[PDB]
Design an enzyme around this catalytic site. Sequence first.
Site, PDB file in Angstrom:
ATOM      1  N   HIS A   1      34.000  45.232  54.965  1.00 41.11           N
ATOM      2  CA  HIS A   1      35.421  45.091  54.663  1.00 41.11           C
ATOM      3  C   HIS A   1      35.985  43.691  54.812  1.00 41.11           C
ATOM      4  CE1 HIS A   1      39.747  46.596  55.266  1.00 41.11           C
ATOM      5  NE2 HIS A   1      39.359  47.115  54.114  1.00 41.11           N
TER       6      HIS A   1
ATOM      7  N   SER B   1      38.899  50.758  51.412  1.00 43.32           N
ATOM      8  CA  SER B   1      39.811  50.887  52.540  1.00 43.32           C
ATOM      9  C   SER B   1      40.355  52.301  52.663  1.00 43.32           C
ATOM     10  CB  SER B   1      41.007  49.943  52.373  1.00 43.32           C
ATOM     11  OG  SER B   1      40.621  48.588  52.354  1.00 43.32           O
TER      12      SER B   1
ATOM     13  N   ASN C   1      43.639  47.723  59.341  1.00 41.21           N
ATOM     14  CA  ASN C   1      44.560  48.609  58.655  1.00 41.21           C
ATOM     15  C   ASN C   1      45.053  49.756  59.513  1.00 41.21           C
ATOM     16  OD1 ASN C   1      44.714  47.133  56.301  1.00 41.21           O
ATOM     17  ND2 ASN C   1      42.910  48.129  55.400  1.00 41.21           N
TER      18      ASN C   1
ATOM     19  N   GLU D   1      35.117  43.131  58.695  1.00 45.85           N
ATOM     20  CA  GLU D   1      34.802  44.311  59.490  1.00 45.85           C
ATOM     21  C   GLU D   1      33.506  44.948  58.988  1.00 45.85           C
ATOM     22  OE1 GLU D   1      38.761  46.213  58.663  1.00 45.85           O
ATOM     23  OE2 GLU D   1      38.817  46.594  60.823  1.00 45.85           O
TER      24      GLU D   1
HETATM   25  N1  LIG Z   1      44.045  44.330  47.283  1.00 46.89           N
HETATM   26  C1  LIG Z   1      43.548  44.092  48.517  1.00 46.89           C
HETATM   27  O1  LIG Z   1      44.022  43.135  49.160  1.00 46.89           O
HETATM   28  C2  LIG Z   1      42.463  44.886  49.147  1.00 46.89           C
HETATM   29  C3  LIG Z   1      41.867  44.723  50.536  1.00 46.89           C
HETATM   30  C4  LIG Z   1      40.738  45.645  50.894  1.00 46.89           C
HETATM   31  C5  LIG Z   1      40.254  46.564  50.062  1.00 46.89           C
HETATM   32  N2  LIG Z   1      40.809  46.777  48.753  1.00 46.89           N
HETATM   33  C6  LIG Z   1      40.167  47.757  47.870  1.00 46.89           C
HETATM   34  O2  LIG Z   1      39.118  47.058  47.259  1.00 46.89           O
HETATM   35  C7  LIG Z   1      39.000  47.338  45.847  1.00 46.89           C
HETATM   36  C8  LIG Z   1      39.119  45.996  45.164  1.00 46.89           C
HETATM   37  O3  LIG Z   1      40.407  45.896  44.541  1.00 46.89           O
HETATM   38  P1  LIG Z   1      40.915  44.674  43.673  1.00 46.89           P
HETATM   39  O4  LIG Z   1      42.223  44.229  44.197  1.00 46.89           O
HETATM   40  O5  LIG Z   1      40.000  43.509  43.539  1.00 46.89           O
HETATM   41  O6  LIG Z   1      41.198  45.315  42.179  1.00 46.89           O
HETATM   42  P2  LIG Z   1      40.916  45.019  40.673  1.00 46.89           P
HETATM   43  O7  LIG Z   1      41.526  46.129  39.891  1.00 46.89           O
HETATM   44  O8  LIG Z   1      41.472  43.669  40.377  1.00 46.89           O
HETATM   45  O9  LIG Z   1      39.316  44.982  40.434  1.00 46.89           O
HETATM   46  C9  LIG Z   1      38.459  46.146  40.269  1.00 46.89           C
HETATM   47  C10 LIG Z   1      37.505  45.984  39.240  1.00 46.89           C
HETATM   48  O10 LIG Z   1      36.632  47.143  39.222  1.00 46.89           O
HETATM   49  C11 LIG Z   1      36.048  47.225  37.963  1.00 46.89           C
HETATM   50  N3  LIG Z   1      35.262  48.473  37.831  1.00 46.89           N
HETATM   51  C12 LIG Z   1      35.697  49.766  37.825  1.00 46.89           C
HETATM   52  N4  LIG Z   1      34.747  50.687  37.656  1.00 46.89           N
HETATM   53  C13 LIG Z   1      33.589  49.944  37.542  1.00 46.89           C
HETATM   54  C14 LIG Z   1      32.220  50.274  37.331  1.00 46.89           C
HETATM   55  N5  LIG Z   1      31.710  51.483  37.178  1.00 46.89           N
HETATM   56  N6  LIG Z   1      31.281  49.278  37.267  1.00 46.89           N
HETATM   57  C15 LIG Z   1      31.708  47.978  37.411  1.00 46.89           C
HETATM   58  N7  LIG Z   1      32.955  47.576  37.598  1.00 46.89           N
HETATM   59  C16 LIG Z   1      33.872  48.581  37.659  1.00 46.89           C
HETATM   60  C17 LIG Z   1      37.294  47.044  37.097  1.00 46.89           C
HETATM   61  O11 LIG Z   1      37.013  46.743  35.713  1.00 46.89           O
HETATM   62  C18 LIG Z   1      38.045  45.896  37.810  1.00 46.89           C
HETATM   63  O12 LIG Z   1      37.949  44.564  37.279  1.00 46.89           O
HETATM   64  C19 LIG Z   1      40.053  48.401  45.541  1.00 46.89           C
HETATM   65  O13 LIG Z   1      39.477  49.692  45.381  1.00 46.89           O
HETATM   66  C20 LIG Z   1      41.018  48.302  46.729  1.00 46.89           C
HETATM   67  O14 LIG Z   1      41.731  49.511  47.048  1.00 46.89           O
HETATM   68  C21 LIG Z   1      41.910  46.007  48.338  1.00 46.89           C
END
Ligand SMILES: NC(=O)c1ccc[n+]([C@@H]2O[C@H](COP(=O)([O-])OP(=O)(O)OC[C@H]3O[C@@H](n4cnc5c(N)ncnc54)[C@H](O)[C@@H]3O)[C@@H](O)[C@H]2O)c1
EC number: 1.1.1.35
Lengths: 291, 291
Positions: A147, A126, A197, A159
């Site tokens: 997305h 995002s 967003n 999206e």
């Molecule tokens: N929180 C939301 O509602 C939302 C909505 C849209 C987009 N996002 C974005 O989407 C992403 C998902 O976030 P999330 O809330 O699930 O977070 P999260 O921290 O719970 O999960 C991310 C995971 O990525 C893993 N990771 C990191 N580097 C890696 C690699 N090289 N290989 C494999 N795995 C790896 C981590 O170990 C972790 O479990 C974020 O970057 C966030 O900004 C978040």
Amino acid sequence: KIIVKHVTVIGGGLMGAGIAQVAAATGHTVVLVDQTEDILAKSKKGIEESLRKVAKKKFAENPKAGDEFVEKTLSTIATSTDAASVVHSTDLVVEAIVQNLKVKNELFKRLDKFAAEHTIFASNTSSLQITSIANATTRQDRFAGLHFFNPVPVMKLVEVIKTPMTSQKTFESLVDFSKALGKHPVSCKDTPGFIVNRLLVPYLMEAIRLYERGDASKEDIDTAMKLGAGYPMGPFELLDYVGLDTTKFIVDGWHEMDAENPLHQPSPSLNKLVAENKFGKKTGEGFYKYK
Amino acid sequence: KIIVKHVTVIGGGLMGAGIAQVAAATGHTVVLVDQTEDILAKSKKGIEESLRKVAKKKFAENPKAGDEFVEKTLSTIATSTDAASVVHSTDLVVEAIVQNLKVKNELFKRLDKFAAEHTIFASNTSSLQITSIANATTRQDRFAGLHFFNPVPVMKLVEVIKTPMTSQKTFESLVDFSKALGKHPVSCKDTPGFIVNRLLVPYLMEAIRLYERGDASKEDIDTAMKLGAGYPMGPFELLDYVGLDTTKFIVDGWHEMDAENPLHQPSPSLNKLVAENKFGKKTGEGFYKYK
Ligand SMILES: NC(=O)c1ccc[n+]([C@@H]2O[C@H](COP(=O)([O-])OP(=O)(O)OC[C@H]3O[C@@H](n4cnc5c(N)ncnc54)[C@H](O)[C@@H]3O)[C@@H](O)[C@H]2O)c1
Ligand SMILES: NC(=O)c1ccc[n+]([C@@H]2O[C@H](COP(=O)([O-])OP(=O)(O)OC[C@H]3O[C@@H](n4cnc5c(N)ncnc54)[C@H](O)[C@@H]3O)[C@@H](O)[C@H]2O)c1
């Protein structure tokens, strides 16, 4: 035009796991990927718990069925720690890991070498331009944004982001995939914030500013938008719900690439709260305190 | 402690007639004021039809009670073309007329000299600062904003605007009155847009600009905000619902007052549609075509 059957979801957090869950629940063969087996086993447990919660609230008249549903969906969710080991036979890679452009590019660059020729690459990010990430590969025609919204299993919207290089074939594929997940897809260029967003966050910031100005109270602003606009959640309940840290992140980013735009000036209150670790519902407190 | 019982509504339009209908329907004595008898006869005819519509459902199991309700409410709404003659002993004057600052001040400067000493003055205006109108009288301490939302008898919200001259007694009086109408009041200082419009209109314009930029279609943008933000109506559907010309008028005012704020930059498309008299539903066409 190939039909996405095998999905490789990279990221075992809230989003990734949700994406994995919905894909598997709709007949897709999934492989969830994360750094450790404990991370994975734990992520999968969350899927099971969420799925069982679904079961009871759907198959309440035949738990025997709800059980099949949950095991069937769960069985199609294989897991692995090195995505490179399964992309050679996967149709789509949906990345949902840490917001670090460098790490993402290093990931997709390597994945590019293993992936099949048809395999498509998508990022749920995002705060990064799908384009920046796609140029880490030589697969730009098969690279795009996909997305989703938390909680993925519930939010019907998705999206589909098209970079200047995304082929028309890749686009229709993800659009088709989106419908296959039972979601409703929309189109948007690779612009910051995409649709939602881009229209939600700046508004959420304005509400904060109206409060900081002391023009009205949070409780009031929340009531005003819920009753006068019909919104499900007041802006401050929504901020606490989506995360104050998450929000500040996207905004610091936009502000960074356009320091002069007023729509992105930082908020002293949002910063203070964030510096204090008060991220909202996640941490039991944001603009409001919680149970 | 002022308890509002006799209310003078000046303006029989959509907002006016609606404010009179609710006031009368909740036990307050009402005198609706407008420029001509026909206007009035039409306003009161609309109020009667709105009430019937409700009474034919609400009292289906009690036709008799249904009629009494419609008659009693109707007969508690008096009409007149001479405001000065009515406010002699009224408790509250709610103004909802043409959005011309010069005309409002004249009306209020005049009414100010005929109204009883306790009479509270209020304006339902969306594009003017209450402070301005208030300073046309020497009753500023009894002058405030009382902002309702279309359809008045449905929308439960009411913004009670307090200028830095408005007394607490006045504020509280209007807050109790609001609850008396069965509404839910919120407080906001005298600032352009107050709360709802201040946080909704600039969003609606941003939605328009996203579309004007060619980043996404109106259709997907509306679907995006409904499914992704749970909004009842997409920004374009809403724009056609609230009135493109209504919307435009507000934005212009803000632009004139702040010619450099980018949030109020005119929208080529919005101006074109208005120029072509396509204001929305109340025309059968705006960004979309209706019926
Ligand atoms: N929180 C939301 O509602 C939302 C909505 C849209 C987009 N996002 C974005 O989407 C992403 C998902 O976030 P999330 O809330 O699930 O977070 P999260 O921290 O719970 O999960 C991310 C995971 O990525 C893993 N990771 C990191 N580097 C890696 C690699 N090289 N290989 C494999 N795995 C790896 C981590 O170990 C972790 O479990 C974020 O970057 C966030 O900004 C978040
Ligand atoms: N139309 C909307 O959706 C909407 C939403 C919010 C606020 N407003 C504001 O609310 C007010 C009510 O608007 P409306 O939609 O009912 O408009 P309207 O034009 O339908 O009604 C205004 C009424 O004012 C009367 N009037 C004008 N000058 C007068 C005077 N000197 N003395 C007595 N009567 C006079 C007119 O004859 C007319 O019946 C306006 O100030 C407007 O800016 C409108």
